[PDB]
Design a protein around this ligand. Structure first.
Ligand SMILES: *C\C=C(C)/C=C/C=C(C)/C=C/C1=C(C)CCCC1(C)C
Ligand SMILES: CCCCCCCCCCCCCCCCCCCC
Ligand SMILES: CCCCCCCCCCCCCCCCCCCC
Ligand SMILES: CCCCCCCCCCCCCCCCCCCC
Ligand SMILES: CCCCCCCCCCCCCCCCCCCC
Ligand SMILES: CCCCCCCCCCCCCCCCCCCC
Ligand SMILES: CCCCCCCCCCCCCCCCCCCC
Ligand SMILES: CCCCCCCCCCCCCCCCCCCC
Ligand SMILES: CCCCCCCCCCCCCCCCCCCC
Ligand SMILES: CCCCCCCCCCCCCCCCCCCC
Ligand SMILES: CCCCCCCCCCCCCCCCCCCC
Ligand code: NA
Length: 265
């Protein structure tokens, strides 16, 4: 199956990696619910013209709360403790750990996160529907091909890399079109609003690069090594959670500041 299943069915998890991974994943869905409330309550401090941005943040949190709750209970109900051996092991009766909850929350969210900037800033030379269509297509294909490649994380590894690599090409296209978007969005706004735009670019750049980092994490130190272990599991799932807070919550928080700043023309 995946690589988490491998460790829980050949070596187990110490009670310190199981609970750490259950606490940081629960942190993940709790945040999403505080961002659901924050975005609703803030829908007023922005003009009607930018409110579709906040709405899209509200919906993105509804799908993040629900599905990250799922992934969280998918990890805790997939491993049972062995007092004899003293570690946590894959449970044959449970449903096994399954990434598909996360990856699905990615495919729902990517049009929305990408589409929403185009309600705050104004393009100059590009065409709205041209940018929109390019985002929805490559965003969807990125998450899809990345959902394929990680199926073989344990089996065909050359598949795991080459399919992720394909998912990375769509990712670099998105980065291109976001980059052009940020740029035209700076034309004819204040220096203050331009500073915030610059923030949303460094935030978009780091948060989104984290994801393939988690994808590869157990293989970043060889065929065996430090990470080829429960430690790379602890690490891959802590990185994913920081990426989910950064790209969905801090991203929308920042975009709300810009809208607010642009309310004062
Ligand atoms: C939760 C919201 C968003 C926008 C999530 C984005 C996730 C990625 C950009 C993940 C990308 C991948 C890459 C670059 C290559 C391997 C497969 C991944 C899906 C992990
Ligand atoms: C610039 C305006 C102030 C930014 C506030 C950001 C609010 C984020 C709300 C979600 C964070 C909740 C963290 C605790 C959840 C547990
Ligand atoms: C604008 C006001 C932002 C307030 C943010 C408070 C977030 C609290 C998170 C939980 C503590
Ligand atoms: C405008 C009121 C700001 C509310 C802060 C966001 C709610 C945090 C919930 C935890
Ligand atoms: C349309 C915004 C809400 C999307 C919800 C997606 C369905 C979540 C499924 C959770 C159980 C798996
Ligand atoms: C089209 C590929 C996008 C990701 C699909 C994820 C579906 C898996 C849902 C997990 C449900 C576990 C049972
Ligand atoms: C504007 C939002 C359009 C996409 C919402 C649904 C996400 C894709 C469903 C899979
Ligand atoms: C300088 C404005 C802040 C941009 C980054 C905001 C998030 C920092 C981590 C909390
Ligand atoms: C935008 C937030 C920046 C996060 C940088 C990566 C945090 C380090 C976590 C890696 C743990 C190994
Ligand atoms: C495009 C893929 C980016 C992966 C970043 C991983 C960084 C590893 C550094 C060693
Ligand atoms: C001008 C830009 C300033 C916006 C600041 C936004 C930073 C808010 C940080 C909230 C962190 C929420 C995550 C809590 C983790 C626990
Ligand atoms: Na996995």
């Amino acid at each position: 199956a995946n690589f988490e299943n491998f460790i829980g069915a050949t070596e187990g998890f110490s009670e310190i990696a199981y609970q750490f991974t259950s606490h940081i994943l629960t942190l993940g869905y709790a945040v999403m619910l505080a961002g659901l409330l924050y975005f609703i309550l803030t829908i007023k401090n922005v003009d009607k013209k930018f409110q579709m941005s906040n709405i899209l943040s509200a919906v993105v949190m509804v799908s993040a709360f629900l599905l990250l709750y799922a992934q969280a209970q998918n990890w805790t109900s997939s491993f049972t403790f062995n007092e004899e051996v003293g570690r946590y092991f894959l449970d044959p009766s449970g449903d096994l750990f399954n990434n598909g909850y996360r990856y699905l929350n990615w495919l729902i969210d990517v049009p929305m996160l990408l589409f929403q900037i185009l309600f705050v800033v104004s393009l100059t030379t590009s065409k709205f529907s041209s940018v929109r269509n390019q985002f929805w297509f490559s965003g969807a294909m990125m998450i899809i091909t990345g959902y394929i490649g990680q199926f073989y994380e344990v089996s065909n590894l050359t598949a795991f890399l080459v399919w992720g690599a394909i998912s990375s090409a769509f990712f670099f296209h998105i980065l291109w079109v976001m980059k052009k978007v940020i740029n035209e969005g700076k034309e004819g706004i204040s220096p203050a609003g331009q500073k915030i735009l610059s923030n949303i670019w460094i935030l978009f750049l780091i948060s989104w690069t984290l994801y393939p980092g988690a994808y590869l994490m157990p293989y970043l130190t060889g065929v065996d090594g430090f990470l080829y272990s429960e430690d790379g599991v602890m690490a891959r799932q802590l990185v994913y959670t920081i990426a989910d807070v950064s790209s969905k919550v801090i991203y929308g928080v920042l975009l709300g500041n810009l809208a607010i700043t642009l309310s004062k023309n």
